[PDB]
Each structure stands twice: as C-alpha cells, then as structure tokens.
Subunit: 148 residues, 6 copies
C-alpha cells in the first residue's frame, strides 16, 4: 500500500516525545517499514528542504535540523499520507486541535516537533533520500482485522 | 434520561479495544445500563440492518457482524445519542478527527470498530431488539456533580 | 485453555472503573469469553459466598453485592487464575503495590473494587453459577503472537 | 510572555479531574506561575462574575462557585489565552470536540468543569483579583526546546 | 481522617510532572485539602530539614529546595501516610519498582522528584509549618463508594 | 555514562508495542543513542545467542528472532543496565509484576516481547555487534533536572 515519510525533529527528540508519537501511529493500524536515529548531514538537509532554497529563511531550517538527532521513519497503509498530516495538525501548533500531536504538545512554529510528506510524490522523493532500499521492509503483514 | 445503543463490532473485539471504548464513555459521565458479549444470530442481524435489505451490500454487513463476538451496550444521559456519534467520528475512519475513536484507531470503512444509533427513534428500536427488559437497569443513579 | 471468573463489584461500577479494568486484561493477552451487567439476586449471592455462611459477617458481603450493578466476566488464557490475582493485588488495597488495580484505585477492604477466583476449582464452580453455557464462547482465537 | 487565569470549578475538583487538567497544560509547554486551592468568598465571586450582575442567573453562578473548593491557577506562554480556551472547548460540553477537556469529561452547561479568561484584558483583571503579587512567579524559565 | 504532607521538589516541577503526580493520588481516592506553588524561603527550608542540621550535607538539601518553585500539598484519607510512601517508592529511584513515581520517572538520589512525611508525627509538624490553618479544608466530603 | 542494548522482538513489533516501550524509557530519563528496525540475519542471530549454542533449544531462539522485524536500540544513563531489566520484569511474564513491561503485556516465555543486556560486559559485546560506531551518538545531552 501507500507510504509516507515522517521525521521527528530535534526538539521532539530532546523533549522525549518519540515513543508517544510512534505509539499513536501503531494504534491507528499503520505499519512501520523504516526507522532510524541519525544526525542529519548538511547536504542531506539541503536536499530535503530543496523546494525552499531561493527564500531567505532556507538556512534557518537547515541549521536547525542538523543541530541534533532526528528519528526518521516511514509507515505504510491506506491513505497514510493525508491521514498522517491530519494526525500531526496544522503549521501553527497554537491553532492545531486538541488530540493532534502539535495541538497537544506544541507552542511555536519553529519548534513544531514532527513533520510528514505533503503528497505522494513528495513522499517517494523523501523516502528514497533518507533510506537505502535494504533498510525498508519488502514484505508487510498487517492485522486482518484492519482491512476488508 | 435519553439512551443510545452501541455495538463494538467483531474487528473491535478482536483488536482488544473494548475496555478502552467503555472507559471513554464512563469518563464523559454517561451511565452503563446494559452490557453483554454475544455472537449475533443471522435473523437478529437481518433485523438490525433492516433499512438496507433492498441494496446489494446487505449480505456483506450481515455476514461480517455474525463472524465473531460483538459487545453490545446501552448508555444513559443528556443528549447521549448525538454525543456518542460525535465521539465515534464519521463513516470514513481516515477522515475522522484525532481524539475520536475511529480517528485514533480505524483505517477502513468496512472495519470501523463500533457503531451507535443515528437518532432517538432508531435507538428505541435497536435497544428493544438486542436487549430483553430485565437485562436493563430501571433505577439509574449518576454523579450529582454532573447535572445541575 | 484455563479460565477465571472476575466480578467488578458495585463500588467499582459506581466509580467508573469498568473499562479501565477490562483494558488491563485485554492488554495482557487474555481473551474475553463472557461479559454481562446485572443486579445480583439474594440467592445467587448466598451461593457465591457459600464458604463463608457460618461466620457473622456473611450478611454484610451479601447485602453489599446486591446493592447495585455488578459486571461479571470470564477471561481465558495460560495461568489466567493466578495471574489475574496478581494483577488485582492483595486483600488490603493500602498494602497492594502501585501498578495493581487495588494498589492504584483502592483504599478500604470493604470497598476493594473487584475480585477473582482463588483457584481453578473455585473458578469452575463460580463460572457455572453466574453464566449459562450459551453465554460463553466455545471457539477462542487469540493472537498467534502470544503463544509459541 | 502572556498569561491566563484558569479555575477548575467545584464539580471538577469533586470528580478528581485536577491533575489530569494540569497535566494537559504542562504537556503543551505552558509554565505554571500560580496555583492554590481555596473556597471562594461571596464578595470575591461577585467581583469575578461582575459583568453579569444585571442578569437574573447571576446568583446561581455565585452560589455554585462558593459551594466547594476551587483550584485556581495561572499559566504563561505564547498565545496562552486563546490556546487555553481551544483546549477547554466550547460552552456546551455535549458539543465540544473529543480531545478537549469538556468534550472528554463534561455533559451539562452548569457543570462544565473549568474555565479560562476570554481575552487578555479579562485575564489581567482576573489574575490581580484571585492572586496577590507575591504568590506569582517573577522569573520564568521554560524549555529552550519550545521557543525559537 | 489522617493527613500527610507532600512536596514536589524543583526538579519535578521543572520536568512537568505535577499534574501526573496529583492525578495518581486523586485516582487512589485520597482527598486534596491543601495546595500551593511557592519558592521556599531559606529559614522555612532549614526548619523543614531540621533533623539533619548536624550533618555536612545539610546545606545541599537547603540550597536545592530553594533554587526553584515547589508545589506543596496535603491529602487526607485512611493510612494516607504509609500509602503515599509506598506510591512514591524508595530513596534510590533506580531501585524503586515500576509503577511507583520514582520507579517510573527518576534516576538520581539527589533528583528524586517528590517526597512525603515519614510518620504521622512528622506530618503534623510539616503541615503546620508549610500551611496556615485557613489554607486547609475543614470539611472533607469523599466518595461514599470508597469507605464502608 | 553506562549503556545497555535492548531489542524488541518480532512478537512485540507485530503487536504494536514499540512506541509504548520507548516511551517508558524516555519518561525514566534515559537517553536514546541508537535505534533501527531490521530483519536480523542468521549469522547475526547465532552470534547474539552465542552463549547458548551447545544446548538443544539454540535453533528455536535463532529461528524466531529471524522470522520478522526487530527494533534494536541502545539507551544511556546511570545504572541503565540493571534498571532496564527491572523495568522489563523476569523471564516468565505470568510472574512479572504489574507495572513491568512483561507483567502488563506478556503471557508466554517464548513470546516475552523484549530483552535487555544482563550485565555491562554483555552490553558492550551486544552493542558493538548490532551497531556500527557511526550509528551511535557521541555527544549526549540529558536534562540537567535529572542529575545532581
Ligand atoms: Se516540517
Ligand atoms: Se517532513
Ligand atoms: Se455501523
Ligand atoms: Se450501531
Ligand atoms: Se472479593
Ligand atoms: Se470473585
Ligand atoms: Se466559566
Ligand atoms: Se474563568
Ligand atoms: Se525527600
Ligand atoms: Se517531604
Ligand atoms: Se531475551
Ligand atoms: Se537482549
């Protein structure tokens, strides 16, 4: 099925939010097919935020995501891309709804904990960039109580 | 006060979601006046989904709800019918909001965990169908800290 | 496999602890094979607490368990009888350990929330007493990730 | 930064909801700068609900908030006033969304658990009314992982 | 009934553990009769840790408890003094059992989150020291579902 | 500081327990310095369970740990090796105490969810075996509210 890329950013890792976030997605029925902790490299970051390189606040994003460990993961299931964003909330955590990750835990735009792919095309780009193919599960077996 | 009928369907029971769901309603202040586990009978199912019998996907619904145990319950309180639906979410779990039962736990329309009565008239029909009157509490005593 | 009888007593039901308790057992991997809410009858109570009828405080026990709704259930799995007691705690809730049901929620011996069968022989007696055989599941299917 | 006044009303205190509510705000990243339990005085109540004194249901509000203990607190952070209201929900708990405090726990307008300041001007009035300045923290140190 | 004094120390407050801890005691059925946040004064601290003044590490304790906000509370119920200690754990958090507060959250002896009175005589001394009598509830009404 | 190796075995991953387990260790104050999901290779497994190769049930262990994904992690803090085992419980999940991971979630010896290093010497062997040195954090920054 479909796949999305998720990164819990350095402020999320530092605040001890990793297991909480993973648990939310496992409980929803999405299946974990990639997971690692790493300190992102400058040129991985610059590729990651590539669509923003002609703007002034490009360097801020890059600087921040390389300042500490990130946990990177990909999950698989039906409509996982749009669903995962709904679960995260909206860009401003102050305006995100109670029950969403940023709604529950976040307070500042620059420290908004986690992000996910914004479309299926982005996700395929992002997944291939952060993860070598031997790091990803080929055979997925989900609960038969989940799909009809 | 008002009453609604709720059924946690076989996929919810199989996935170990029963106590979680009951706990959500107890925490809200609704009072439990009926509860049993049972494997629904063909002709109970056909009555339950009666308003759909002239459609092609009637047999699917019936087939599924009889394939395993269901836990059936009725709860009592002010506006319990509309409230319980709000707590469950909307038909597609992918589109249900974080914080709602289907929003948190569900992924497929056919495996959407639980359902409740969609009106007060439905509820009275459904309650009398699943539950003999001696199975239901007559005298309800709720928290005085709940109503004014 | 093995089976135990559990009753959440009227103080547990009144305090909204039902779903919490059920959820603890589901999370452990035990499977729910019986469940109902009922107001126990005098002569069911007198049979239930039969081994105590020659003591003075017999009537207290009986009086109390009939004063409100009880939720009765049976669960099935390996060593479920001894395990369930370990999860409940010890007779005095004040002395029960944090993490146990009475340790977390209880404060008085007479209001100790829940109880379970104290042996396999008790359990078979108790189960047959509270539950007609058509109320109990015959075919149990647990997670294959639980047993080897 | 900004500050709001919150009061968990006597129905919230009686129902054992205090720590749950505080925990929600701590998890969001707001910082606790005031906290006490007290039984409000008639003339403190009449000042508190001052903007309603020319209406008939003034006396109800006053009567109720003085009938038991209240826990009063102030929290500090970016957009804390509007954010806290979003977390509480809307006036009718039945219509508040799952994930919000009233959405999860409340059922009646008159027993709606908690309230917060509805603007920054209200908050400054309310804070100075319930709290002497030596009861409030002067120096606040929040997580650097929260703000940019 | 009986009463104990509890203080969540500055490391507990800073780590956002306040509501979690309060919630544990509310869930057990103990009743909150005192609560405030304050920055302890040197001479309050020196009285508090009075039985240790002839030892070398007296000044450390005093220095630390005055370095930030503390939330002080007293709870009331049957055997609340011994019970509360059991819930906290033992002096070394590393050796405290899962389910206990220090067992779940703590790692260092000097940063062990919370403490409670070690006897009824200590509690009466400590309560009168931290709390003026008008700050304490006179009339306590607990759940009738708790005591027999 | 000290480090231990932890593996959540294929039954834990399949049952959706990963985020729950990680969250327990983050809440305790231990810091995550390694994390990946992988399907273990035969000869990695045979090295991992090396001290058991002369026994008959060697092949079972190997067969099982290679049958699905494992999430491997290392955590760092004071007494992390002995502490982590205390948190997991004892070999038989039925006999593990409520509050421990196996006590809460497990039922069978062969399906006991997770394991950790049994000494500091084992941990150094195990860590170097599962993790290349560039996969591990060099610079650790924990909460200053944790250590004295
Ligand atoms: Se992002
Ligand atoms: Se992202
Ligand atoms: Se449904
Ligand atoms: Se339903
Ligand atoms: Se009992
Ligand atoms: Se029992
Ligand atoms: Se309010
Ligand atoms: Se308020
Ligand atoms: Se202490
Ligand atoms: Se203390
Ligand atoms: Se193990
Ligand atoms: Se292990």
């Amino acid at each position: 099925k479909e796949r999305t890329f998720l990164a819990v950013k350095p402020d999320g890792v530092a605040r001890g939010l990793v297991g909480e976030i993973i648990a939310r997605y496992e409980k929803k029925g999405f299946v974990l097919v990639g997971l690692k902790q790493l300190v992102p490299t400058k040129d991985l970051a610059e590729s990651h935020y590539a669509e923003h390189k002609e703007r002034p606040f490009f360097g801020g994003l890059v600087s921040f995501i390389t300042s500490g460990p990130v946990v990177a993961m990909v999950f698989e299931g039906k409509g996982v891309v749009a669903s995962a964003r709904l679960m995260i909330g909206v860009t401003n955590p102050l305006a995100s709804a109670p029950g969403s990750i940023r709604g529950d835990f976040g307070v500042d735009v620059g420290r908004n904990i986690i992000x996910g792919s914004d479309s299926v095309e982005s996700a395929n780009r992002e997944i291939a960039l952060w993860f070598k193919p031997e790091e990803l599960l080929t055979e997925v077996k989900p609960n038969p109580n989940l799909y009809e």
